[PDB]
Amino acid sequence: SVLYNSASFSTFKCYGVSPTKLNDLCFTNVYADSFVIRGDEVRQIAPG
Amino acid sequence: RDISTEIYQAGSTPCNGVEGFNCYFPLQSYGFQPTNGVGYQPYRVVVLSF
Numbered sequence: 001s002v003l004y005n006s007a008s009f010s011t012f013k014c015y016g017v018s019p020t021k022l023n024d025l026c027f028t029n030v031y032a033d034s035f036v037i038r039g040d041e042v043r044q045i046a047p048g
Numbered sequence: 049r050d051i052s053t054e055i056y057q058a059g060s061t062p063c064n065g066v067e068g069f070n071c072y073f074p075l076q077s078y079g080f081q082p083t084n085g086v087g088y089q090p091y092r093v094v095v096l097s098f
Contacts, residue, residue, distance in 0.1 A: 005060060007069050 015047050 001023065003012065013019060037044075057063045059070025064079075080090060 007059075007061070 010042075013046065 003009075004021075017025075053075055055063055055066075055071055055075055056074055057071045057098055063071030080088070
Protein backbone atom coordinates (compact mmCIF):
# COMPACT_ATOMS: atom_id res chain seq x y z
CA SER A 1 0.00 0.00 0.00
CA VAL A 2 2.84 2.42 0.79
CA LEU A 3 4.31 2.01 -2.70
CA TYR A 4 0.87 2.53 -4.24
CA ASN A 5 0.01 5.70 -2.31
CA SER A 6 3.45 7.32 -2.23
CA ALA A 7 4.01 9.50 -5.31
CA SER A 8 7.77 9.55 -5.83
CA PHE A 9 8.18 7.06 -8.71
CA SER A 10 8.09 7.19 -12.50
CA THR A 11 6.82 3.66 -13.27
CA PHE A 12 4.57 1.45 -11.16
CA LYS A 13 2.68 -0.49 -13.85
CA CYS A 14 3.24 -4.22 -13.37
CA TYR A 15 3.66 -6.29 -16.53
CA GLY A 16 2.78 -9.52 -14.72
CA VAL A 17 -0.12 -8.93 -12.33
CA SER A 18 -3.21 -6.75 -12.24
CA PRO A 19 -2.40 -3.37 -10.62
CA THR A 20 -5.66 -3.31 -8.62
CA LYS A 21 -4.30 -4.65 -5.32
CA LEU A 22 -1.88 -7.42 -4.37
CA ASN A 23 -2.27 -7.53 -0.57
CA ASP A 24 -5.14 -10.01 -1.09
CA LEU A 25 -3.57 -12.79 -3.18
CA CYS A 26 -0.95 -15.09 -1.66
CA PHE A 27 2.34 -16.30 -3.16
CA THR A 28 5.58 -17.82 -1.89
CA ASN A 29 9.33 -17.26 -2.32
CA VAL A 30 9.14 -13.67 -3.53
CA TYR A 31 11.70 -12.88 -6.22
CA ALA A 32 13.27 -9.45 -6.65
CA ASP A 33 16.11 -8.37 -8.95
CA SER A 34 17.53 -4.85 -8.78
CA PHE A 35 20.20 -2.84 -10.57
CA VAL A 36 21.19 0.73 -11.45
CA ILE A 37 21.04 2.19 -14.96
CA ARG A 38 21.80 5.42 -16.74
CA GLY A 39 18.80 7.67 -17.35
CA ASP A 40 18.87 7.04 -21.11
CA GLU A 41 17.91 3.33 -21.07
CA VAL A 42 14.67 3.80 -19.12
CA ARG A 43 12.88 2.28 -22.13
CA GLN A 44 14.35 -1.20 -21.56
CA ILE A 45 12.09 -1.98 -18.57
CA ALA A 46 9.41 -3.75 -20.60
CA PRO A 47 8.63 -7.32 -21.75
CA GLY A 48 10.82 -8.53 -24.60
CA ARG B 49 -24.98 2.55 -21.95
CA ASP B 50 -22.21 4.74 -20.53
CA ILE B 51 -21.13 7.91 -22.30
CA SER B 52 -19.25 9.88 -19.65
CA THR B 53 -15.56 10.78 -19.82
CA GLU B 54 -15.10 12.72 -16.58
CA ILE B 55 -11.73 12.49 -14.83
CA TYR B 56 -11.37 9.17 -13.00
CA GLN B 57 -9.67 9.62 -9.64
CA ALA B 58 -7.60 6.55 -8.77
CA GLY B 59 -5.66 7.38 -5.60
CA SER B 60 -6.58 9.21 -2.42
CA THR B 61 -5.17 12.55 -3.59
CA PRO B 62 -8.06 14.67 -4.94
CA CYS B 63 -7.88 15.42 -8.66
CA ASN B 64 -9.98 18.19 -10.21
CA GLY B 65 -8.03 19.57 -13.17
CA VAL B 66 -6.14 17.75 -15.92
CA GLU B 67 -3.79 14.81 -16.49
CA GLY B 68 -1.92 14.13 -13.26
CA PHE B 69 -0.90 11.34 -10.94
CA ASN B 70 -3.52 8.75 -9.84
CA CYS B 71 -6.20 10.43 -11.98
CA TYR B 72 -6.71 9.69 -15.68
CA PHE B 73 -9.44 9.83 -18.24
CA PRO B 74 -10.73 6.40 -19.26
CA LEU B 75 -11.02 6.22 -23.05
CA GLN B 76 -8.10 4.62 -24.89
CA SER B 77 -7.99 4.06 -28.64
CA TYR B 78 -7.78 0.76 -30.49
CA GLY B 79 -4.73 0.16 -32.66
CA PHE B 80 -5.61 -1.04 -36.17
CA GLN B 81 -2.63 -1.06 -38.55
CA PRO B 82 -2.42 -3.17 -41.73
CA THR B 83 0.63 -5.01 -40.38
CA ASN B 84 -1.24 -6.71 -37.52
CA GLY B 85 -2.13 -10.31 -38.30
CA VAL B 86 -4.98 -12.40 -36.94
CA GLY B 87 -6.49 -11.33 -33.64
CA TYR B 88 -6.14 -7.60 -34.34
CA GLN B 89 -8.46 -7.06 -37.30
CA PRO B 90 -11.92 -5.44 -37.16
CA TYR B 91 -14.58 -7.99 -36.24
CA ARG B 92 -18.18 -6.89 -36.75
CA VAL B 93 -20.64 -8.07 -34.10
CA VAL B 94 -24.43 -8.15 -34.37
CA VAL B 95 -26.60 -9.30 -31.46
CA LEU B 96 -30.27 -10.25 -31.89
CA SER B 97 -32.60 -10.46 -28.89
CA PHE B 98 -36.12 -11.87 -28.68
